[PDB]
From Swiss-Prot:
Fe(2+) binds at H102, H104, E108, H147. It is an enzyme of class 1 (oxidoreductase). Its EC number is 1.13.11.54, 1.13.11.53. The gene is mtnD. This is Acireductone dioxygenase. Its cofactor is Fe(2+); Ni(2+).
Length: 173
């Protein structure tokens, strides 16, 4: 009963928390889930949303190999880092775009560096489920999966946006 990356299935309000049951579940639905060594992260970068460019390029350096592997697996090109939190003067106005149910023509892959997030993703059967993400969680939302995204009750995330193509973060509503 230690939980990482829990699922809340929507219409039947059910939670899968045991971590083998979750990774298997996400496997059935076409979604990659990996856990990386978030403990390979320095303390200064632990929960730092006032991120500078020397910071972002180090977060990237720490996880270069994991990125490499995931980029190789899905044949992706680039990566960056974004921090969302109160004290982003435009949080609401950004988030609103991706809370609207959408899909992309590429996988959307994200690794949670600090804070939390939730991807609500349309299952194969037809039912949505929430994928509640903590620091250390890597997630790929497959191309054409219908989803939306949301911050948790903490209202702050820092993620590594990894990219198949430039044109694939674009929401198709």
């Amino acid at each position: 009963a230690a939980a990482m990356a829990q699922i809340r299935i929507h219409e039947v309000n059910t939670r899968i928390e045991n971590e083998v049951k979750v990774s298997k579940f996400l496997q059935e639905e076409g979604v990659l889930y990996e856990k990386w060594n978030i403990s390979k992260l320095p303390p200064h970068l632990n929960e730092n949303y006032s991120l500078t460019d020397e910071n972002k390029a180090e977060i990237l350096a720490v996880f270069s190999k994991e990125i490499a592997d995931v980029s190789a697996r899905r044949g992706y090109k680039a990566h960056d880092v974004i921090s969302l939190s109160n004290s982003t003067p435009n949080l609401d106005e950004l988030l609103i775009n991706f809370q609207k149910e959408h899909h992309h023509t590429d996988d959307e892959v994200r690794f949670i560096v600090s804070g939390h997030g939730i991807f609500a993703i349309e299952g194969k059967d037809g039912t949505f489920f929430d994928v509640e993400l903590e620091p250390g969680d890597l997630i790929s939302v497959p191309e054409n999966a219908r989803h939306y995204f949301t911050l948790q009750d903490d209202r702050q995330v820092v993620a590594i946006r990894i990219f198949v193509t430039t044109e694939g973060w674009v929401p198709i509503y």
